[PDB]
A paper describes a structure:
The human [name]+ ATPase [name] ([name]) is a protein disaggregase in the mitochondrial intermembrane space (IMS) and functions to promote the solubilization of various mitochondrial proteins. Unlike canonical [name]+ proteins, [name] contains a unique ankyrin repeat domain ([name]) at its N-terminus. The N-terminus of [name] has a mitochondrial targeting signal (MTS), followed by an ankyrin repeat ([name]) domain, and ends with a C-terminal NBD.
For functional analysis of the [name] domain, we determined the crystal structure of the [name] domain at 2.1 Å resolution. (A) X-ray crystallography structure and AlphaFold predicted model of the [name] domain. The RMSD between these 2 structures is 2.6 Å. Interestingly, the insertion contains 2 patches of hydrophobic residues, implying a potential role in substrate binding. Our data showed that the [name] domain is indispensable for the disaggregase activity of [name], and a deletion of the unique insertion in the [name] domain resulted in more than 50% reduction on the disaggregase activity. Next, we analyzed the dimer interface of the [name] domain by docking the [name] models into the density maps of the double-heptamer and double-hexamer.
Residue numbers in the entry: 132 to 297
Write the structure that this text describes.
């Protein structure tokens, strides 16, 4: 309800104390914004490592995909005005992303890689996030990475996936 919306706002704010309280009051740990993203997603894109750990410890699914596509596609798909979609995505999710691109199926790991924050990536991988999972465009978290530790962290986890699969 409003408690699910309060969860997402606290996730954006990195307010771990508030996230834990709302979770204790029955907020859905996998609640989705009307435009299609989760609390773990909005925490990941904003480098909110503190809240990511709280969400993972409370059972958040790290492999869900954003139902948000682009301002253009989501405006038509859902029948909202494009300016409202753009403002909402910039204000309630992130304003440094190119939201003209397509994000459908992006997981929290996708967003954590786009933010170039090794700590959030490492925590998401320890929470069971699939580094081989593709978005609607077919891109994995690797495909969004850049030369650095984030790639290396991904490469070893991807290597361990082949090793530890069943």
């Amino acid at each position: 309800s409003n408690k699910d919306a309060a969860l997402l706002e606290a996730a954006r704010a990195n307010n771990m104390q508030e996230v834990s309280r709302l979770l204790s009051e029955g907020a859905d740990v996998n609640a989705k914004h009307r435009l299609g993203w989760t609390a773990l997603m909005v925490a990941a894109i904003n480098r909110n490592n503190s809240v990511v750990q709280v969400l993972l410890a409370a059972g958040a699914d790290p492999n869900l995909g954003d139902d948000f596509s682009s301002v253009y596609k989501t405006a038509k798909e859902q029948g909202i005005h494009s300016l409202e979609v753009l403002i909402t995505r910039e204000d309630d999710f992130n304003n440094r992303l190119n939201n003209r691109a397509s994000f459908k199926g992006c997981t929290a790991l996708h967003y954590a890689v786009l933010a170039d924050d090794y700590r959030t990536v490492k925590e998401l991988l320890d929470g069971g996030a699939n580094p081989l999972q593709r978005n609607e465009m077919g891109h994995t978290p690797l495909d969004y990475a850049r030369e650095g530790e984030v790639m290396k962290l991904l490469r070893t986890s991807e290597a361990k996936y082949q090793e530890k699969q069943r």
